Paper text:
PqsE has two biochemical activities, a protein–protein interaction with RhlR, which increases RhlR transcriptional activity at target promoters, and an esterase activity. Curiously, RhlR function additionally depends on the metallo-β-hydrolase enzyme PqsE, encoded as the final gene in the pqsABCDE biosynthetic operon. With respect to RhlR, PqsE is required to form a protein–protein interaction that enhances the affinity of RhlR for target promoters. The effects of the PqsE E182W and PqsE NI substitutions on pyocyanin production are not through impairment of PqsE catalytic function, as the catalytically inactive variant, PqsE(D73A), remains fully capable of interacting with RhlR and driving pyocyanin production. These results indicate that PqsE has two independent functions, catalysis and interaction with RhlR, and it is interaction with RhlR, not catalysis, that is required for virulence. Moreover, the RhlR–PqsE interaction is essential for P. aeruginosa virulence phenotypes, and therefore, of interest as a focus for antibiotic development.
We recently showed that the ability of PqsE to interact with RhlR can be weakened by the introduction of an “inhibitor mimetic” mutation in which the glutamate residue at position 182 is altered to tryptophan [PqsE(E182W)].24 The PqsE(E182W) variant is a stable protein that, while harboring all of the catalytic residues, nonetheless displays less than 10% of wildtype catalytic activity, as if an inhibitor is bound in the active site. To understand, at an atomic level, what conformational changes the E182W alteration induced in PqsE to affect its ability to interact with RhlR, we determined the structure of PqsE(E182W). Although the PqsE(E182W) crystals grow in the same P3221 crystal form as WT PqsE, there is a significant structural rearrangement in the active site. In WT PqsE, the sidechain of E182 lies at the edge of the ligand binding site and makes hydrogen bonds with R191 and Q272. These interactions do not occur in PqsE(E182W), and rather, new interactions are made between the sidechain of the introduced W182 residue and F276, L277, and P278. The E182W change induces the rearrangement of the G270-L281 loop between helices 6 and 7, with a portion of that loop becoming disordered. Examination of electron density within the active site indicated a surprising consequence—with the sidechain of E280 relocating by 12 Å and becoming Fe bound in the center of the active site. Indeed, the repositioned E280 sidechain directly binds both Fe atoms, acting as a bridging ligand, and thus is most likely responsible for the stabilizing effect the E182W alteration has on PqsE, which we have reported previously. The crystal structure of PqsE(E182W) revealed that a loop rearrangement inserts the E280 residue into the active site to coordinate both of the iron atoms at this site.
Residue numbers in the entry: 0 to 272, 275 to 297
Write the structure that this text describes.
Amino acid sequence: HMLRLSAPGQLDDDLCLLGDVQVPVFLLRLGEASWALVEGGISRDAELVWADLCRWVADPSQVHYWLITHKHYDHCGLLPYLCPRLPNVQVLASERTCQAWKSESAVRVVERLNRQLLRAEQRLPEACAWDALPVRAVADGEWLELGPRHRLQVIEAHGHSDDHVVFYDVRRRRLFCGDALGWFDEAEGVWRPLVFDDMEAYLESLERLQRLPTLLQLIPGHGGLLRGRLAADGAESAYTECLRLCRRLLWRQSMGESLDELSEELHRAWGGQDFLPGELHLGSMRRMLEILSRQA
Ligand SMILES: [Fe+3]
Ligand SMILES: [Fe+3]
C-alpha cells in the first residue's frame, strides 16, 4: 500500500530496513563512516540481519549505536549475537530495559522465547553475556546526538511494557514508536492494542505522543514504515482502537462472556489461525484482556 513501506532495503535517503519486515532492524546512515541500528529483533534472524547489514556497511566497526525500545524478546534478541561483530557499537536503552538484561529470570524468558523460533537446522552465533552488552542507559527526555544530521529524543512511553521508550527525530518528523501504539493490522488498516502492562499508562503515553509535532514517518516495532495520514493520525488512531477494545470487553463481559471466551474470539477475528506478531497469541491476548478488565 502507498502509505506503508514494508519491503527490505532502502526506505529513505538515510534509512534502510534489514531482515524480516515482521521483526525488522532499521539502519540509519549517520555519516560517511558512521551508522546506527534501531530495534533489536529476534535471535534466529542474526545471520539474515548480518547479511543484510553487510550489503550496506562495508566496515562493521562503523556501526556506533543500537537503539532499543523495550525488553521484550522480539526487540532485543539479536544483541548477544551481533554485538560481538560490532566492536564499536553502543547499545542505548532505558534504565529499566538495561535492568532486564542483568536479571537472571528475565534473560531466561527472553532466551526461551527466542529459542522457540529457531528452525531445527540453524545454530546461533557465538554470543556474549547479556550482562556484558556494551550498554549506555538513556533517560526520559534525553537528546541522542547520533551524528551531524541525526538528533533523536528519548520519550518514555510505558504501558505496553513498564520499560518502553520511543525515539523521535524532530528534524524528520520521524517516530520510532516500538509497540506503544500496538500492532498495525495491514489487513484492516487499523491498530490492534498491545496492552501487556498498564492500560492507564498506555493511554497516557498515546496522549503525550499526539502532542508531538505532526508526524511524517511512523515506524513501529513490526510491519515497516508508515507515512502520510497513517503517520499523522497514528497515535490518535491507536488511542481510539484501545478504547474501542475496552468497550467491547465491557460489553461482552456484561453479557456473561468469560475472558477466555473473548480471548479466543479476538485471537480468531484478528487472524491468529504467522499472521499476528509473535507476541500476540492466545495467552498474551488473555493477559491484555485481564489488564483491561481490572482497570475498568
Ligand atoms: Fe512488545
Ligand atoms: Fe513486539
